[PDB]
Amino acid sequence: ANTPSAKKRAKQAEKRRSHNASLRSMVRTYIKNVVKAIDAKDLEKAQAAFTAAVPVIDRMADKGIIHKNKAARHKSRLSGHIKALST
Amino acid sequence: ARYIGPKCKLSRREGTDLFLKSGARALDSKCKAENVPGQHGQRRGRLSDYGLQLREKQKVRRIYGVLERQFRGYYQEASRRKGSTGENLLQLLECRLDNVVYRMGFGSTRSESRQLVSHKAITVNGQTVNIPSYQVKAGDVVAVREKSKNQLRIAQALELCGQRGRVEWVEVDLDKKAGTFKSAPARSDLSADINENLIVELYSK
Amino acid sequence: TVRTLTGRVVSDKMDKTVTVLIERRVKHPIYGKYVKRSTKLHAHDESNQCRIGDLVTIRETRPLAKTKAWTLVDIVERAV
Amino acid sequence: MVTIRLARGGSKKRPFYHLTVTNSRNARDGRFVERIGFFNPVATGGEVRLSVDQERATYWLGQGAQPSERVAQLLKDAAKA
RNA sequence: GAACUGAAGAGUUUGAUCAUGGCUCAGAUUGAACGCUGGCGGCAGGCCUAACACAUGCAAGUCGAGCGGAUGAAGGGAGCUUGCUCCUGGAUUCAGCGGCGGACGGGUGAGUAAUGCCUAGGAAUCUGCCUGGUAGUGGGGGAUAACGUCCGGAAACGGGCGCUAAUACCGCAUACGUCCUGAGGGAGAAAGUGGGGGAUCUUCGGACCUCACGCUAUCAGAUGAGCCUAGGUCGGAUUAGCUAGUUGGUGGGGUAAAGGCCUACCAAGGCGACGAUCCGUAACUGGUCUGAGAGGAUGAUCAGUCACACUGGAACUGAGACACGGUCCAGACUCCUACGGGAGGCAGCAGUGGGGAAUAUUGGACAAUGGGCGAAAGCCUGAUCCAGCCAUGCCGCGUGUGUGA
RNA sequence: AGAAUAAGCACCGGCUAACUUCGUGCCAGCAGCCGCGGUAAUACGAAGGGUGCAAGCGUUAAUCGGAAUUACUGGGCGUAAAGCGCGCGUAGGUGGUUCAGCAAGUUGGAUGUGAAAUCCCCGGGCUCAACCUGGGAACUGCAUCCAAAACUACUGAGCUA
Ligand SMILES: [Mg+2]
Ligand SMILES: [Mg+2]
Ligand SMILES: [Mg+2]
Ligand SMILES: [Mg+2]
Ligand SMILES: [Mg+2]
Ligand SMILES: [Mg+2]
Ligand SMILES: [Mg+2]
Ligand SMILES: [Mg+2]
Ligand SMILES: [Mg+2]
Ligand SMILES: [Mg+2]
Ligand SMILES: [Mg+2]
Ligand SMILES: [Mg+2]
Ligand SMILES: [Mg+2]
Ligand SMILES: [Mg+2]
Ligand SMILES: [Mg+2]
Ligand SMILES: [Mg+2]
Ligand SMILES: [Mg+2]
Ligand SMILES: [Mg+2]
Ligand SMILES: [Mg+2]
Ligand SMILES: [Mg+2]
Ligand SMILES: [Mg+2]
Ligand SMILES: [Mg+2]
Ligand SMILES: [Mg+2]
Ligand SMILES: [Mg+2]
Ligand SMILES: [Mg+2]
Ligand SMILES: [Mg+2]
Ligand SMILES: [Mg+2]
Ligand SMILES: [Mg+2]
Ligand SMILES: [Mg+2]
Ligand SMILES: [Mg+2]
Ligand SMILES: [Mg+2]
Ligand SMILES: [Mg+2]
Ligand SMILES: [Mg+2]
Ligand SMILES: [Mg+2]
Ligand SMILES: [Mg+2]
Ligand SMILES: [Mg+2]
Ligand SMILES: [Mg+2]
Ligand SMILES: [Mg+2]
Ligand SMILES: [Mg+2]
Ligand SMILES: [Mg+2]
Ligand SMILES: [Mg+2]
Ligand SMILES: [Mg+2]
Ligand SMILES: [Mg+2]
Ligand SMILES: [Mg+2]
Ligand SMILES: [Mg+2]
Ligand SMILES: [Mg+2]
Ligand SMILES: [Mg+2]
Ligand SMILES: [Mg+2]
Ligand SMILES: [Mg+2]
Ligand SMILES: [Mg+2]
Ligand SMILES: [Mg+2]
Ligand SMILES: [Mg+2]
Ligand SMILES: [Mg+2]
Ligand SMILES: [Mg+2]
Ligand SMILES: [Mg+2]
């Protein structure tokens, strides 16, 4: 780079990336656990995973890592799958 | 720009009135103004229609001392103006400042009137105008400088123009060296010999 | 007041879809004579009640698939 | 934001200004949405110094458009009249 | 009330004539060039070719009312003396963290014959700064840069150990608005700074009341952007067949949003002489030049949209980028080197080489209009405002005037 | 203070405004098209004299016009270029006459848009103009509705040329 503000923006960008990656991994981990819980054909563990996953999903949606429509879509679809499994 | 050269060789070539001198003695007994110039001068030289258009266009341009870019701009403006462009061209070309300060009686020749108007010696409402192309709106009191009212060239030009005719549409007060224009001249006012239609025939080709 | 479009069914070999031909007569820009042009559209037939030859009227909606954004509102004429 | 400012028409050393309602991320005389009047810094003769349209300006302010400093001064001076 | 009102022919085939028929001419215009010649002013315009390679100089910073640190004046006083130091204080300046801006403004027309442009529409979306309402801004923690110390290096600097600040970061406290969940219940945030002050607890340290800026959740308004449908958009048929994610459905995934956008199965569909596919060529429009008109040619200046940024790809940061002076990888070409490794991108403004028939100064200032930053002074601005060279264009004025046989 | 201090270029046979002489002698040369020149050249090269433009004047390259010479407005095919060697027939184009309906074409109107500038008309400013600028007009286009039914199309029922 040439202007020092470009350098500062760059380094703040790698810091922001190294931050955001961990939290994106965390949310993906929680939804993945939930999804493999439903796909394993068990209800109680699916209930527990959903209850333990919604708070982090919504906290992250508010935190600005992901967009809120995405979180709402995830919640609705997973709840629909579990309710379908309930029968 | 302007034309510099003999002022009666042109008259000899054209063979018509072509006012270009003070008119002190006469129009004839200076240059035998009936033959075209040069060695080949006695021949009448019957000329075609294009000759007619060229000859009268040169006639009008030389009598009013206007160049051809300016003249064609004048013609385009006349064509733009409504109501029989042929006389619109004459009416608009008459309202030039130098020709007005001539015809108001302040100058011996068109060239001398241009001499006076260019060197900032004439007013319109007191404001210095020195463009020998200014189109004078009707109503303006064209006058010479209060400083310049004592010059004898204006006096001699005025006494010479005292006997040249009356146009019967301007109102001129001569004591104070001032003019006044009320309304634009009509077609019948100007010399009804040269036709305007042949010019517009020339420029329509 | 939906903006409909009337047309003639041409082919319906794809499930829950129908092909409609719409005929217009456009004036030639210079020669002043009218020429009949045609347009082919795909419409969503939810209950595949449109056979070939029927004459129907469709309506514009959001895209249902790629190159399929019209839905038939009702059949107005059948076929022999 | 969307702001009201001056667009420089006219000729060299003879300015003229259009009071333009433009998005602030646009050129000086680029695209706009509406024009409310003009300001002439030469006046003279029958030329008017300034004129604006009051109702459209009130509408634009009621929709929250920030006027520039010179535009603000001229609009308040016009509102005085 | 006015918005137009306009159309010319000639020469040349013959010993001569009429007709047909081609060639040439008289007009208006160019970003024009060349030859001869040359006084001035005003307004405009100025690499059309090599999107060929580029020396140096300039073209994006700003905030101490966010934060530690260090520079710490003037001083109220003291010591010995007339100079310094020091207690308390303290006006200035900024390397670093942090907040905005850098996605605007500016340039070019390579690609692109349709995911572009123009006309008319519509439904499933997002949106910082701006405006109007509503509800709040409580309490904790773990670090780290700079700063010391050590190692390593030619440099950019890299690494080990110690400690610190916040409007940097993450839990915790509740939900007028919101999200999903069918009712049922559940889910999800905040940062404090500057100016004052009556009374109260108390070091009016602080708590408390007010104002200013600022922060959080949400509804609406504009502003900007994304997506879909119908019609139009160069020449060639001596280019007639093209397509297997291709056409439609179901389940799932994905995006802010509809959708074969992606995937697994189901059937064999879809487009085309109303010109599909392929080849060549080319940014599009308002508009410009001509013409009586209908048309014909065209896209110099100015304005709207699109695309690109040495060549080819990819993502991160954000409200918005696949990013014009940001990052990473690979390549070509120039350069430094201690041989380990590094640096560069004028299609930003002047400038040079080269190409060409041919297109200019390595100039000034923030004075004005805008832009970015800050509350305010104010800084930055080759955008902009002015200068320079050029008969390149349009317009205007001069080189005089009368008499003089 | 001083007329002081600042005119060139092309052309002159016809088309196209403007002529004589001298020098060569189908040589040298000119040229947009016809064409000039071989011993009086208004056409070559020079002189005088004129004609046309003018701080410019010519030349070249490019577009439209003239060209009704791609003819919708607005051409032709016996002999000048131009009727397939001749039938049958697909898509397409066209459709005798009456009654009735509908309203796509067709006609009139309303509404929204057709960005600004540029073009046109009337004003304002710089001594005028170039140039700048106010107001209006216009942008033949496109879309959505309302009304009419003569003609065409679509629907039904007839008639016989
Ligand atoms: Mg929380
Ligand atoms: Mg949030
Ligand atoms: Mg001139
Ligand atoms: Mg002969
Ligand atoms: Mg003949
Ligand atoms: Mg600093
Ligand atoms: Mg741009
Ligand atoms: Mg270029
Ligand atoms: Mg192609
Ligand atoms: Mg924070
Ligand atoms: Mg289309
Ligand atoms: Mg498949
Ligand atoms: Mg489906
Ligand atoms: Mg599917
Ligand atoms: Mg699509
Ligand atoms: Mg083709
Ligand atoms: Mg092109
Ligand atoms: Mg190209
Ligand atoms: Mg084109
Ligand atoms: Mg292009
Ligand atoms: Mg015209
Ligand atoms: Mg014509
Ligand atoms: Mg260009
Ligand atoms: Mg533009
Ligand atoms: Mg790009
Ligand atoms: Mg790229
Ligand atoms: Mg290059
Ligand atoms: Mg690169
Ligand atoms: Mg982001
Ligand atoms: Mg950038
Ligand atoms: Mg660069
Ligand atoms: Mg440059
Ligand atoms: Mg060069
Ligand atoms: Mg060269
Ligand atoms: Mg400013
Ligand atoms: Mg700087
Ligand atoms: Mg000049
Ligand atoms: Mg020249
Ligand atoms: Mg002649
Ligand atoms: Mg000659
Ligand atoms: Mg001789
Ligand atoms: Mg000769
Ligand atoms: Mg023609
Ligand atoms: Mg021609
Ligand atoms: Mg013929
Ligand atoms: Mg024959
Ligand atoms: Mg026959
Ligand atoms: Mg045949
Ligand atoms: Mg037949
Ligand atoms: Mg048939
Ligand atoms: Mg009939
Ligand atoms: Mg028929
Ligand atoms: Mg109509
Ligand atoms: Mg317009
Ligand atoms: Mg009716």
From Swiss-Prot, chain A:
A GO CC annotation given for this chain: cytosol
Pfam family for this entry, one: Ribosomal_S20p
Organism superkingdom: Bacteria
Region (Disordered): 1-22
Gene Ontology molecular function: small ribosomal subunit rRNA binding; structural constituent of ribosome
PANTHER family given in the database record: 30S RIBOSOMAL PROTEIN S20, SMALL RIBOSOMAL SUBUNIT PROTEIN BS20C
Organism: Pseudomonas aeruginosa (strain ATCC 15692 / DSM 22644 / CIP 104116 / JCM 14847 / LMG 12228 / 1C / PRS 101 / PAO1)
Basic residues: bias regions: 6-19
Sorted UniProt keywords: Ribonucleoprotein, Ribosomal protein, RNA-binding, rRNA-binding
Presence of the UniProt keyword Ligase in the record: no
InterPro entries listed in its UniProt record: Ribosomal_bS20, Ribosomal_bS20_sf
Disulphide linkage map: none
GO biological process: translation
Name this protein carries in UniProt: Small ribosomal subunit protein bS20
Function: Binds directly to 16S ribosomal RNA.
Family from the record: Belongs to the bacterial ribosomal protein bS20 family.
From Swiss-Prot, chain B:
S4 RNA-binding domain segment(s): 95-155
Subunit structure: Part of the 30S ribosomal subunit. Contacts protein S5. The interaction surface between S4 and S5 is involved in control of translational fidelity.
Name of the featured protein: Small ribosomal subunit protein uS4
GO terms, biological process: ribosomal small subunit biogenesis; translation
InterPro entries: Ribosomal_uS4 (IPR022801), Ribosomal_uS4_bac-type (IPR005709), Ribosomal_uS4_CS (IPR018079), Ribosomal_uS4_N (IPR001912), S4_RNA-bd (IPR002942), S4_RNA-bd_sf (IPR036986)
The species this protein was found in: Pseudomonas aeruginosa (strain ATCC 15692 / DSM 22644 / CIP 104116 / JCM 14847 / LMG 12228 / 1C / PRS 101 / PAO1)
GO molecular function: rRNA binding; structural constituent of ribosome
GO cellular component, one term: small ribosomal subunit
Keywords, alphabetical: Ribonucleoprotein, Ribosomal protein, RNA-binding, rRNA-binding
Designated gene of the protein: rpsD
From Swiss-Prot, chain C:
Leader sequence residues: none
CDD domains: Ribosomal_uS17 (cd00364)
Transmembrane segment boundaries: none
UniProt-recorded Gene Ontology molecular function terms: rRNA binding; structural constituent of ribosome
Alphabetic keyword roster: Ribonucleoprotein, Ribosomal protein, RNA-binding, rRNA-binding
Gene3D superfamilies membership: Nucleic acid-binding proteins (2.40.50.140)
GO terms under cellular component: cytosolic small ribosomal subunit
Entry's Gene Ontology BP terms: translation
Function: One of the primary rRNA binding proteins, it binds specifically to the 5'-end of 16S ribosomal RNA.
Stated family: Belongs to the universal ribosomal protein uS17 family.
NCBIfam families, per the entry: PRK05610.1, uS17_bact
Subunit structure: Part of the 30S ribosomal subunit.
Record-given protein name: Small ribosomal subunit protein uS17
Biological classification of the source: Bacteria, Pseudomonadati, Pseudomonadota, Gammaproteobacteria, Pseudomonadales
UniProtKB/Swiss-Prot annotation, chain D:
Gene Ontology annotations for the cellular component aspect, listed alphabetically: cytoplasm; small ribosomal subunit
Gene3D superfamilies (UniProt xref): 3.30.1320.10
InterPro entries: Ribosomal_bS16, Ribosomal_bS16_dom_sf
Keywords: Ribonucleoprotein, Ribosomal protein
Listed GO MF terms: structural constituent of ribosome
Alphabetical list of SUPFAM superfamilies matching this protein: Ribosomal protein S16
GO biological process, one term: translation
Family matches, as Pfam families: Ribosomal_S16
Record carries keyword Zinc: no
Family to which this protein belongs: Belongs to the bacterial ribosomal protein bS16 family.
Stored NCBIfam families: S16
UniProt cross-references to HAMAP family, sorted A to Z: Ribosomal_bS16
Stated name of the protein: Small ribosomal subunit protein bS16
Organism: Pseudomonas aeruginosa (strain ATCC 15692 / DSM 22644 / CIP 104116 / JCM 14847 / LMG 12228 / 1C / PRS 101 / PAO1)
